[PDB]
Design a protein around this ligand. Structure first.
Ligand code: MG
Ligand code: MG
Lengths: 301, 48, 50, 89, 40, 49, 257, 48, 145, 294, 49, 186, 273, 48
């Protein structure tokens, strides 16, 4: 079933476009004029819709009757396949799970249980009473309000999309001499705050690495966040605990308004032979205690 | 230290007042080099 | 690395942890939420700096 | 060794005048100091303290923590009895 | 040198859950009114 | 329903840039189209060659 | 790191352990015929900074024959940090300090003929230059394990390389390994973090489910009279009236719902 | 001569600047720009 | 863990991995019927520094044991030496004698998957020339003792 | 930083003012990021060289990288006899004249950067004003709810300029294709054949042939046709936002509007100052009907 | 560059380069537990050029 | 509904009071002080748990036997106390001072102060970034002129159904597409 | 192979002790013993030096660096100046609108004490010293009623308070103004009193509570450094929120934070927050 | 941040957010007007 429906594209036929349709579509795609039909749907989107509804319309049961698969048959293939997984295989799996299932796992509700069982066409214990209960309760809202397909639809901060950060920026440069490319040069690219943009840079580096089929620098998150690293190390040594320091446990000292002046004139008057000296990753460290806190993790160093 | 320059700070505002009523507010070398400190330490402050 | 801390679930013996005697079997302690235990020598397979 | 401890006690130029030398003039034996250190030693190096560190972010999100069956989750009210179960664990 | 450990501070209430903040209070989280310039 | 209707409408229909008096439509002390003074100015003029 | 005449030249920075004292070296050969990196003996006193942890400047100070460069003709001194221009990670040598007589590299005017050995290559990204196809592979000392003149694809072909990267449809393409990247601030917001236990670190994120003894009467009263408010501990359960259940990683700052 | 834009007749202006910037709230440069600007327009520019 | 602790330990540890350690670990992987790890380890070894130095070497014993376990354990896409035929699989396969995979059909499906892939990625496929024919001459079928 | 961000906001704002197009925040910041990195490159290369300032006679010498860093100081033993104060001032003034020379260099460099930046903005800017629908009215013409009123005075003084040929479109692209047509016409001619064997010819081919760049050599390997981003004909960030969430739409259009207003206010301030400098405008409002009577 | 890159990619996983891929699972590594320090990233171009 | 009218909230950034709160409800003297954990009378305790306090500890009326003691008093006391509590941030602003916790935010600022030396500090000579309009530009065209204006750059009939870009929206259209408009009209 | 900072290449003719290795002199047990002891205490001395450089306060370091900076070869004599520039200036105040006149320091002979004040600021009422009418009553202190003045003036939301002027009282004011619990303060060199300007924020005061340490003058509380150190610690988190003021043997009025810094104990005055 | 922004998303109505995330939506009589659609939370009731 999986081979015929999902994997074989060549057997998939699409409704053929008329000539008028071909023209209107072309001229829509090449040059946009406002007020137009917002749909203009890519045959890519269409195709993927047909596939996902092929996953909708898949039902199990006796296959001497209509449907293709025994349930036992399905979980059998599933079991053979799950044992069959490599490292990056089950990595792809767990990513796929974190992206699709996991958020749904957070947004569920009793109101869905019937629908939740309609996926496998399994019959519940209480099915009539759940019919009644869920009917009465879904009565209290819009039908769009209650369907689990649409509950994830909006995401804050639409200016930077995860889809668009998949291609990492200027990867054809900082690949080739990663030392000449401190986090600053790239951080001018994003209109976000500091913690967020450094976070994003880490993700860029990792995506890039996995893309080029080489292993990523795991010391990179420690390098970009170095100040946060050392603050956490010294906090862990101070309050005795293992974890990451959170806000409640910060010192209650109140600095004066001008407290930063000394450091301000020290920074404003600094000077550097080259730009590498300006931002090297290790300028955070002076005493030996600094070097002992920064590398305590690698028993190599 | 000389009580030549004095100040008044509100939450978000800062007042630097030159006090030398005797010589008609004529700044000495020390007092001027001092004012260029109080002015930029008041001006580079966080809340001003 | 996290130092080992006393008065944990797998640390504390029965009578302090529960006021009852609970049998110590190396298999399936429901109270301790563990499925099974292979019981190697504690500091042998782990790295020493750890 | 502090303030409770026993006290330590105490025209021309002295012998402590000569050892001193201007940082403007090149010193005695030209020991290759690292610039960063001499910056830090005279107090002119821009500070990076623990005060400048924000939150340490979760970068790679761990795993889903699945519900671990406890003694208070049982489908029969009987299995959590007073004669058997004194608490979830 | 601070012998109370932040590791063990608290009282188990049994079933009673309480919230905690990873960093700041959630209300202070999205700053968009100064970011996207909606202010009087 | 009505309030967010109004919010969307007032936000989409608002003007921007500088007017004949050299200021924003939302500027603090100085105003434009007082008592439909421009509306009437179109009433009596009209647009025709 | 640059190439000329067939070999590498790297700038590096030698440093004491406390990083009090430092020396730059501009063009150093990267040569993997040296088991251990060699410096002029005179630097031993230049790099000695007697800190608190090392009352004498160095942890290790001894005499070795050191006849490899050219009976105790040299001195092993450790540990001196070394920062190479390309690399993010410091490399920590315990070098041979050689006097003038043992070996004298003055070789050209102003030029000290310093080079880097496998002491320091093992610790850098430079090490990946040591494998077949790299730029140091020619200069490895001859072995049974290292074939001198073979073409790269010949060598890797023997190790079992058949086609180009992900060329066969059976192996997934490298860049689909990571498709989605999870950043809380950019999408759906932060998690709602609760705990049952002593602290956030000592407890579980999970509340107790509906099957609890104390929750059953309450949940009952809550199913039957749905509209009025009900007393109980049944509030603390993972299950409740509202369509939004309490389970870990609820995104509560998300616009929808 | 256009050496400066600002002029005022108000007694003890300095106090009023202080107390005005006490009632102000945020540090975002939108806010700062408006607070400073409103101060200037209402007093130091001679509109009325 | 032991293999890491071999170079990590100050007191009992060796500076570089001895050959003894290598062939020992390999022997564990052979004796665990552990395929993936044996392959990856072998390749990692021949990519190490000790290998390039000449210190660790792949011997004939390691080599042939490696091959032994490579034969006798299940391969993901293919039938392996030391896969036992099942008489009763005829219930499904349709035949009692032969092996339940045909390398020819496997190759063909590989070609098909190659085109399906080029389509999934570029949205369009180049039609092969008329002089193009799949070369099946190099394929041999499964032999069974 | 400032001079750039002002112009970029000019572009973004204008882009939404004239046509209904929004620029993606992503894009807006990545322009600036490119300027920044340009400056950074110029810095990288600027530190390989040194500038020498010199004070009295030649007897105080200061060697400093153009960024203002100090590398060497040479001094006559004459100086050693002065005073600590005067020694300090002397060296400090040499350092100053060094920083002067360096800063002259850097400012040429920066002019160069500004030019490259403009050249990179040009397909966008000339993207918005080179369309058959684009227009402007004079800033002194009254605007009323129907449309814009006519400025009365000096019917000679208003001249409408037109950037577009009114007959069939000749786009910049046709001009570049014309340029390479003339390149080939010149090359393939007999006199051009003899010229391609000169030093001038091979300088031309080394700089401006990309086609002959060996595989793996830095730089573009084809000649590129000039980018065409016609503003009213290309949907950019408003269509994606309108499909996804209305709220982000309203916020981004709001940002563009605000930026445009701000730019316009700046232009009014500069105009006012230039008007005051030449004495046509007073220093406080003397005409209040120009404000209060609307 | 293409060869330095090729080699690094190959010693990352060999199973990317096989026409019929065998099981690819991570094993131990010879440099240490921190071996990524001596391995990672992409081959680097000489800085002069 | 009287309890929802009186709802209070608590800033949990600090997770418990950072100073002692000494406050009396009517006749009931209450002390809310910082503790290692939650310590209180069972009822007061799960009231303080209702706020999400980890580190608070609280006592009502010295000795527990002290008058007046009612269930009412026990509740009203702890709620009154909590309602008198000041958050640390609020205290810090109250004195016109910067909290130790919020200083990290200044870091990027302070960072590019340090990094502004050299070219990054440099501005283009001659150019302010403020470019005033001088002339008036209008490229608009009569419809018949733009009918075939973009035929070479793009396809013929470029402006076809475009309502904003044409004074005659229906020109250039083939009959079918003209019919479509009316078709949706009726 | 170009080398920077390494001074003449290959140094100059210096062999190590172990490498050169001249034949070891045989010292009598005397010589050897003495070598061992002098070089042992040489190492001890060095360890001391390093610890002292580690523990040096920043102010000390700055004074040192800028002292060396100005250092000349000859120790030059001070130059004769104007008749004086160095009179401490009088702090500015307005004569016409006043709490009190700012009295010149040039009049320092005219001044009285807190007990027997010289006639000045006649136009203003004079605060009276607060003393007990009978035996059982507490014996009041300028600190006691300083705190209660401020507390009551904070409850009535007043801008200015006239308050008793003694050494530790205006000490307390300077400390409170440091921490920003008080808008400002001034001593006019009026004998009896001086004035404090209160600060309000968000509609209530900046001062929650302000309390004196002792009710009597007959009771004097001494604060151990460990106690003042306990205050700073809220179950493992450093708390400077509350301020405690105290006298030192050195007659300084300090908060508990500076006291803990230099590890000195002091006598308690008041708490405020 | 004394007066934080809080929850700013208008994609649903206040009453729809309230409905989904809060049990308080089920008891409209027990809540005053100022808090009506304003709560996203579940409340426990304890009768003393
Ligand atoms: Mg300092
Ligand atoms: Mg009683």
């Amino acid at each position: 079933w999986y081979l015929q429906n999902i994997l074989s594209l060549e057997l998939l036929k699409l409704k053929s476009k008329t000539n008028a349709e071909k023209i209107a579509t072309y001229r829509s795609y090449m040059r946009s004029l406002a007020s137009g039909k917002d749909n203009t749907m890519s045959d890519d989107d269409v195709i993927r819709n047909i596939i996902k509804e092929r996953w909708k319309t898949l039902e199990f049961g006796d296959r001497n009757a209509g449907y293709p698969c025994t349930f036992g048959d399905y979980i059998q293939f599933l079991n053979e396949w799950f044992k069959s997984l490599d490292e990056e295989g089950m990595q792809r799996l767990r990513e796929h799970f974190d992206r699709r299932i996991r958020p749904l796992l957070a947004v569920m509700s009793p109101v869905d249980i019937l629908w939740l069982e309609a996926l496998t066409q399994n019959s519940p214990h209480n099915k009539e009473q759940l019919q009644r209960k869920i009917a009465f309760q879904t009565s209290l809202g819009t039908p769009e309000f209650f369907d689990m397909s649409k509950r994830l639809r909006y995401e804050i901060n639409e200016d930077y999309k995860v889809r668009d950060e998949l291609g990492p920026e200027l990867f054809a440069l900082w690949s080739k001499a990663p030392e000449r490319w401190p986090p600053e040069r790239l951080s001018k690219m994003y209109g976000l705050d500091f913690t967020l943009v450094r976070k994003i840079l880490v993700w860029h580096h990792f995506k890039a690495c996995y893309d080029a089929c080489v292993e990523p620098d795991w010391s990179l998150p420690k390098r970009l966040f170095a100040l946060e690293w050392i603050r956490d190390v010294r906090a862990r040594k101070h309050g005795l605990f293992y974890g990451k320091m959170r806000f409640a446990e910060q010192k209650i000292t109140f600095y004066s308004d001008r407290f930063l002046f000394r450091d301000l004139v020290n920074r404003r008057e600094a000077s550097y032979a080259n730009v590498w000296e300006m931002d090297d990753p290790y300028r955070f460290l002076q005493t030996e205690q600094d070097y002992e806190d920064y590398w305590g993790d690698n028993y190599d160093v | 230290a000389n009580r030549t320059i004095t100040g008044n700070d509100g939450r978000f505002s800062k007042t630097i007042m030159i006090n030398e009523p005797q010589c008609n507010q004529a700044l000495s070398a020390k007092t001027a080099s001092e004012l260029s400190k109080e002015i930029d330490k008041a001006t580079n402050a966080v809340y001003s | 690395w996290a130092p080992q801390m006393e008065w944990g679930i797998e640390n504390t013996p029965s009578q302090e942890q529960y006021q009852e005697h609970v049998p110590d079997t190396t298999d399936a302690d429901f109270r301790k939420q563990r499925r099974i235990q292979s019981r190697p020598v504690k500091w042998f397979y782990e790295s020493h700096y750890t | 060794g502090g303030p409770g401890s026993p006290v330590r006690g105490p025209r021309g130029y002295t012998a402590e005048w000569r050892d001193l030398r201007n940082p403007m003039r090149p010193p005695e034996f030209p020991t290759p100091w690292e610039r960063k250190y001499r910056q830090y030693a005279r107090g002119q190096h821009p500070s990076y303290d623990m005060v400048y560190a924000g939150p340490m972010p979760e970068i790679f999100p761990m795993r889903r923590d699945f519900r671990k069956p406890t003694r208070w989750d049982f489908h029969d009210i009987e299995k959590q009895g007073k004669y058997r179960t004194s608490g979830p664990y | 040198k601070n012998l109370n450990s932040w590791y063990t501070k608290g009282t188990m209430r049994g079933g009673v859950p309480r919230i905690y903040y990873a960093w700041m209070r959630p209300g202070s989280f999205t700053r968009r009114r100064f970011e996207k310039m909606r202010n009087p | 329903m009505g309030e967010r209707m109004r919010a969307i409408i007032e936000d989409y229909s608002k003007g921007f840039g500088l007017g004949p008096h050299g200021h924003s439509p939302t500027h603090d002390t100085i105003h434009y189209n007082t008592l439909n003074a421009e509306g009437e100015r179109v009433r009596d003029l009209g647009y025709t060659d | 790191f640059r190439m000329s005449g067939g070999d590498m030249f790297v700038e590096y920075k030698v440093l004491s352990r406390d990083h009090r004292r430092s020396i730059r070296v501009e063009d150093a050969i990267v040569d993997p015929t040296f088991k251990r990196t060699v410096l002029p003996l005179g630097w031993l006193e230049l790099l000695r900074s007697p800190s608190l942890r090392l009352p004498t400047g160095y942890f290790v100070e001894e005499t070795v024959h050191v006849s490899l460069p050219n009976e105790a003709n040299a001195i092993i001194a450790g540990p001196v940090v070394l920062y190479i221009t390309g690399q993010s990670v410091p490399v920590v040598l315990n070098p041979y300090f050689v006097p003038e007589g043992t070996w004298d590299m003055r070789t050209r005017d102003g030029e000290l003929d310093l080079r880097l050995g496998m002491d320091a290559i093992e610790q850098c990204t430079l090490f990946s230059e040591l494998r077949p196809g790299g730029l140091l592979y020619g200069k490895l000392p001859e072995n049974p394990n290292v074939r001198r003149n073979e073409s790269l694809r010949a060598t890797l072909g023997r190790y079992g390389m058949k086609c180009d990267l992900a060329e066969s449809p059976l192996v997934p393409r490298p860049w689909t390994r990571m498709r989605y990247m999870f950043i809380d601030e950019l999408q759906r917001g932060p998690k709602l973090t609760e705990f049952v236990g002593h602290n956030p670190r000592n407890g579980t994120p999970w509340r107790f489910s509906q099957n609890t003894k104390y929750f059953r009467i309450g949940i009952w009263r809550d199913t039957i009279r749905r509209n009025d408010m009900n007393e109980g501990l049944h509030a603390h359960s993972s299950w409740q009236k509202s369509p939004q259940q309490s389970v870990p990683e609820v995104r509560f700052l998300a616009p929808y719902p | 001569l256009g050496w400066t834009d600002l002029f005022t007749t108000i007694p003890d202006m300095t106090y009023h600047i202080k107390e005005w910037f006490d009632t102000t709230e945020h540090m975002h440069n939108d806010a700062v720009a408006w607070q400073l600007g409103h101060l200037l327009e209402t007093c130091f520019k001679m509109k009325e | 863990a032991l293999w890491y602790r071999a170079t990590e330990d100050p007191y009992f540890g060796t500076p570089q991995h001895t050959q003894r350690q290598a062939e020992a670990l390999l022997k564990v992987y052979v004796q665990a019927k552990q395929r993936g790890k044996a392959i990856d380890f072998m390749n990692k070894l021949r990519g190490s520094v000790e290998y390039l130095t000449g210190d660790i070497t792949i011997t004939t014993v390691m080599q042939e044991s490696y091959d032994a376990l490579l034969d006798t354990t299940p391969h993901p896409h293919l039938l392996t030496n030391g896969f036992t035929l099942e008489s009763d699989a005829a219930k499904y396969t349709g035949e009692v004698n032969k092996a339940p995979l045909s390398p020819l059909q496997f190759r063909i499906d590989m070609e098909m998957n190659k085109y399906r892939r080029q389509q999934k990625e570029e949205g369009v496929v180049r039609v092969p020339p008329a002089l193009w024919r799949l070369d099946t001459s190099a394929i041999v079928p499964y032999k069974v003792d | 930083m400032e001079v750039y961000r002002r112009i970029t906001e000019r572009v973004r704002g204008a882009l939404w003012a004239h046509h209904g197009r929004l620029m993606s925040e992503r894009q807006f910041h990545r322009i600036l990021a490119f300027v920044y990195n340009n400056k950074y490159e110029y810095q990288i290369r600027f530190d390989r060289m040194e500038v020498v300032g010199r004070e009295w006679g030649g007897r105080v010498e200061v060697v400093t990288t153009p960024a203002g860093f100090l590398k060497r100081v040479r001094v006559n033993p004459c100086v050693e006899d002065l005073t600590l104060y005067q020694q300090q001032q002397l060296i400090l003034s040499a350092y100053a004249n060094a920083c002067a020379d360096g800063r002259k260099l850097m400012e040429q460099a920066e002019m160069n950067i500004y030019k490259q930046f403009l050249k990179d903005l040009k397909p966008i800017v000339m993207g918005i004003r080179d369309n058959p629908e684009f227009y402007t009215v004079s800033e002194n013409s009254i605007e009323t709810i129907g449309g814009v009123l006519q400025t009365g005075d000096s019917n000679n003084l208003c001249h409408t300029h037109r950037t577009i040929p009114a007959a069939k479109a000749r786009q910049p692209a046709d001009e570049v294709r014309a340029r390479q047509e003339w390149e080939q016409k010149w090359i393939n001619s007999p006199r051009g054949q003899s010229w391609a064997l000169t030093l001038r010819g091979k300088t031309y081919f080394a700089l401006h042939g990309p086609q002959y760049r060996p595989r793996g050599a830095p730089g573009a390997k084809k000649e590129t046709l000039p980018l065409d981003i016609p503003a009213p004909y290309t949907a950019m960030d408003e269509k994606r936002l309108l499909k996804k969430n209305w709220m982000a739409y309203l916020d981004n259009k709001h940002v563009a509007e605000v930026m445009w207003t701000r730019v316009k206010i700046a232009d009014r301030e500069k105009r006012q100052r230039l008007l005051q400098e030449t004495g046509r405008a007073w220093h406080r409002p003397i005409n209040e009907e120009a404000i209060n009577r609307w | 560059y293409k060869d330095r890159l090729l080699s690094k990619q190959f010693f990352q996983n060999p199973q990317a380069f096989e026409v019929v891929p065998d099981r690819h699972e991570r094993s131990v590594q010879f440099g240490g537990k921190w071996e990524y320090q001596r391995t990672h990233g992409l081959p680097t171009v000489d800085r002069n050029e | 509904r009287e309890a929802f009218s009186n709802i209070i909230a608590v800033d949990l950034e600090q997770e418990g009071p950072m100073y002692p709160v000494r406050v009396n409800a009517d006749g009931v003297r209450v002390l809310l002080y910082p503790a290692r954990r939650i310590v209180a009378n069972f009822r007061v305790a799960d009231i303080l748990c209702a706020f999400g306090f980890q580190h608070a500890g609280c006592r009502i009326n010295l000795k527990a036997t002290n008058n007046p003691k009612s269930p009412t008093h026990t509740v009203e006391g702890v709620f009154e106390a909590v309602k008198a509590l000041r958050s640390v941030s609020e205290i810090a602003a109250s004195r016109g001072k910067v909290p130790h916790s919020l200083i990290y935010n200044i870091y990027p600022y302070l960072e590019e102060i340090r990094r502004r030396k050299g070219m990054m500090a440099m501005h283009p000579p001659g150019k302010d970034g403020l470019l005033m309009p001088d002339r008036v530009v209008d490229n608009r065209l009569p419809d018949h002129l733009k009918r075939g204006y973009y035929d070479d750059v793009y396809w013929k009939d470029f402006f076809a159904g475009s309502d904003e870009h044409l004074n005659e929206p229906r020109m250039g259209l083939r009959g079918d597409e003209m019919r479509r408009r009316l078709e949706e009209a009726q | 192979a170009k080398v920077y900072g390494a001074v003449p290449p290959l140094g100059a003719a210096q062999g190590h002790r172990l490498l050169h290795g001249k034949r070891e002199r045989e010292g009598s047990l005397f010589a050897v013993a003495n070598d061992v002891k002098r070089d042992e205490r040489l190492l001890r001395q060095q360890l001391n030096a390093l610890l002292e450089e580690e523990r040096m306060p920043m102010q000390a370091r700055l004074q040192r660096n800028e002292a060396v900076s100005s250092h000349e070869a000859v120790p030059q004599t001070p130059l004769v100046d104007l008749p004086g520039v160095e009179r401490r200036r009088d702090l500015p105040a307005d004569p016409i609108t006043r709490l009190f006149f700012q009295h010149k320091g040039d009049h320092a002979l005219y001044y009285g004490t807190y007990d027997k004040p010289s006639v000045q600021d006649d136009d203003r009422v004079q605060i009276e010293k607060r003393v007990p009418r009978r035996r059982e009553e507490n014996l009041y202190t300028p600190i006691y009623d300083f705190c209660h003045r401020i507390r009551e003036a904070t409850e009535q939301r007043k801008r200015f308070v006239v308050v008793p002027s003694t050494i530790e009282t205006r000490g307390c004011a300077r400390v409170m103004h440091d921490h920003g619990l008080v808008a400002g303060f001034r001593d006019f060199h009026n004998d009896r009193a001086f004035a404090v300007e209160l600060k309000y924020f968000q509609g209530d005061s900046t001062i929650n509570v302000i309390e004196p340490c002792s009710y009597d003058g007959r009771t004097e509380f001494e604060w151990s450094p460990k106690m003042m150190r306990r205050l700073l610690n809220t179950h493992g988190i450093h708390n400077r929120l509350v301020v405690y003021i105290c006298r030192t043997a050195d007659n300084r009025i300090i908060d508990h934070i500076h006291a803990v810094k230099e590890n000195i104990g002091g006598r308690g005055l008041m708490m405020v927050h | 941040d004394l007066y934080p922004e809080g929850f700013q998303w208008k994609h649903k109505l206040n009453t729809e957010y309230n409905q989904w995330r809060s049990n308080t939506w089920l008891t409209p009589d027990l809540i005053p007007k100022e808090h009506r659609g304003r709560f996203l939370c579940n409340f426990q009731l304890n009768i003393v």
